[PDB]
Design a protein around this ligand. Structure first.
Ligand SMILES: *C(=O)[C@@H](NC(=O)/C(=N\OCC)c1nsc(NP(=O)(O)O)n1)[C@@H]1NC(C(=O)O)=C(Sc2nc(-c3cc[n+](C)cc3)cs2)CS1
Ligand SMILES: *C(=O)[C@H](NC(=O)/C(=N/OCC)c1nsc(NP(=O)(O)O)n1)[C@@H]1NC(C(=O)O)=C(Sc2nc(-c3cc[n+](C)cc3)cs2)CS1
Ligand SMILES: [Cl-]
Ligand SMILES: [Cl-]
Ligand SMILES: [Cl-]
Ligand SMILES: [Cl-]
Ligand SMILES: [Cl-]
Ligand SMILES: [Cl-]
Ligand SMILES: [Cl-]
Ligand SMILES: [Cl-]
Ligand SMILES: [Cl-]
Ligand SMILES: [Cl-]
Ligand SMILES: [Cl-]
Ligand SMILES: [Cl-]
Ligand SMILES: [Cl-]
Ligand SMILES: [Cl-]
Ligand SMILES: [Cl-]
Ligand SMILES: [Cl-]
Ligand code: NA
Lengths: 267, 267
């Protein structure tokens, strides 16, 4: 009856900005959840990089790769939005730095390099997610092409709930061992791109790890986070948005507001 | 406290048969490892043919060779223990069949022929392994000469850990593409020489792919395997053994027992 209220405010927010909002949120201390369109598909945009970095750390743990192995790509032309990979291009990067770059700055060259050499492309990235029991997620395209966000299109999408479930598995569950999870968590905590999204919805003295996506068409953007409040157990929050026209800008405030509503609801 | 125990059992087994046992094992599902003498050198014996097979499939993937190209050797005197190459000698074999034969029956002529025409000799075979980041392994002689297994001699040796690492890279990693890997895995699954070694250490309904070697001096024999349990992730097990006196026979039961101990330990 007050979880119907939260759904009502999400409705009004989607109506206000003429688009579609999907939310899932879990309070891991109590198990209360809140969903709105939590089983509908949204474009992932850059948000899959947060899982991609998890996959790299999993192959480190499986001893297939070394976190300090050097990765050299002097010959490569770098994708648009490659801030870190551009500045390291003379000297190569460690695997760990390239992986955190893909996550903490949404670096496209970093993503594509890791996917081509280590993960088996978008198919391998999808298979990774199947392996932790995520049945929704699908990655079909490489980093620059998967941000088209065309209404009705199911390529490169998941659901809010599935992103939440997977983040909860990787950041708080048992896919990664204690040491490798701590690195994953720290990677998420140092993300640089999410200050106006889920982070903006919470008190400054809480600790937030997140990954954003911004498709740059159809006002499509998203954010997922693990949240550590003071003296309580972790929350998981996952917000996906799209808008009607190709030319619509995304809305960070709509995300932060949906996040705020979702946190109240799981409380 | 229970990983020291596993080391203790390996000790007793080496003392029991008066020789030296080297073990490395990975559980890819958890990343737990187990080593005993895992950084000591042991003779490879025929066990390098499993990597030689991988090398051939890599040049197939590079389209340097065709898997169905005919390989003709009417002119040649065959090495001792060439069961498959002897039976095809009149008509030649496909590259792929020669390669699988080298692996599944430990065919010496097949090995030597491939190394002499396609892989650039013991030097080329060693360089192959450097190319996947295996820095230990060295092949110095051709197929029959490398089986002398002389105590203290470092020619034609590797370490349990390095063999384990490389198998994991080749059989489960991303040196081979999805299609070519599956062939490699099938080759390994149908090995015929390994029934009394690692295979004997595991429940019948698990799937096992392996490659053995038997130097036939100094009781030196070994086996490495990729292991697929029902409803768990792959294991990698690598067991090397040596004995004191020239005339000592190898012990398949010691291998199977070391394997059994190693599997429990990574669990
Ligand atoms: C590589 O290890 C190969 N081994 C050998 O060539 C030699 N000895 O093997 C004897 C145990 C060898 N090298 S040089 C030499 N004599 P020299 O004059 O220099 O003193 N002899 C091949 N690999 C293997 C292997 O273990 O893979 C073997 S042992 C085999 N067992 C079977 C088998 C066993 C059981 N079952 C049910 C079926 C088949 C096949 S090969 C020897 S050849
Ligand atoms: C993934 O979502 C995103 N990738 C993109 O590369 C595109 N984003 O467009 C911008 C909205 C894109 N790919 S294809 C394309 N155009 P085309 O029509 O030519 O195919 N555009 C990467 N991720 C993110 C993200 O949100 O994670 C973004 S947004 C971003 N902002 C920052 C930032 C903001 C604020 N501060 C204080 C610091 C940093 C960094 S990345 C774009 S890149
Ligand atoms: Cl209003
Ligand atoms: Cl709900
Ligand atoms: Cl819902
Ligand atoms: Cl992207
Ligand atoms: Cl490491
Ligand atoms: Cl580009
Ligand atoms: Cl689908
Ligand atoms: Cl914050
Ligand atoms: Cl553009
Ligand atoms: Cl006893
Ligand atoms: Cl060791
Ligand atoms: Cl030695
Ligand atoms: Cl050496
Ligand atoms: Cl077969
Ligand atoms: Cl032995
Ligand atoms: Cl025996
Ligand atoms: Na309103």
């Amino acid at each position: 009856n007050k979880s119907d209220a939260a759904a009502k405010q999400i409705k009004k927010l989607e109506e206000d900005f003429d688009g579609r909002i999907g939310v899932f949120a879990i309070d891991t201390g109590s198990g209360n959840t809140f969903g709105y369109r939590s089983d509908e598909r949204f474009p992932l945009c850059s948000s899959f990089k947060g899982f991609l970095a998890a996959a790299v750390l999993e192959r480190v743990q499986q001893k297939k790769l070394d976190i300090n192995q050097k990765v050299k790509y002097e010959s490569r032309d770098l994708e648009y939005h490659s801030p870190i990979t551009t500045k390291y291009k003379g000297s190569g990067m460690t695997l760990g730095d390239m992986a955190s770059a893909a996550l903490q700055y949404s670096d496209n060259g970093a993503t594509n390099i890791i996917m081509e050499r280590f993960l088996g492309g978008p198919e391998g990235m999808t298979k990774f997610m199947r392996s932790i029991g995520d049945n929704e997620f699908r990655l079909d395209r490489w980093a620059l092409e998967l941000n088209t966000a065309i209404p009705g299109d199911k390529r490169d999408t998941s659901t809010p709930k599935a992103v939440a479930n997977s983040l909860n598995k990787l950041a708080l569950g048992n896919v990664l061992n204690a040491k490798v999870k701590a690195i994953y968590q720290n990677w998420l905590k140092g993300n640089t791109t999410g200050d106006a999204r889920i982070r903006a919805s919470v008190p400054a003295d809480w600790v937030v790890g997140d990954k954003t996506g911004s498709c740059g068409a159809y006002g499509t953007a998203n954010d997922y986070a693990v949240i550590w409040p003071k003296n309580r157990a972790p929350l998981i929050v996952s917000i996906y948005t799209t808008r009607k026209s190709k030319d619509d800008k995304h809305s960070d405030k709509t995300i932060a507001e949906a996040s705020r509503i979702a946190i109240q609801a799981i409380d």
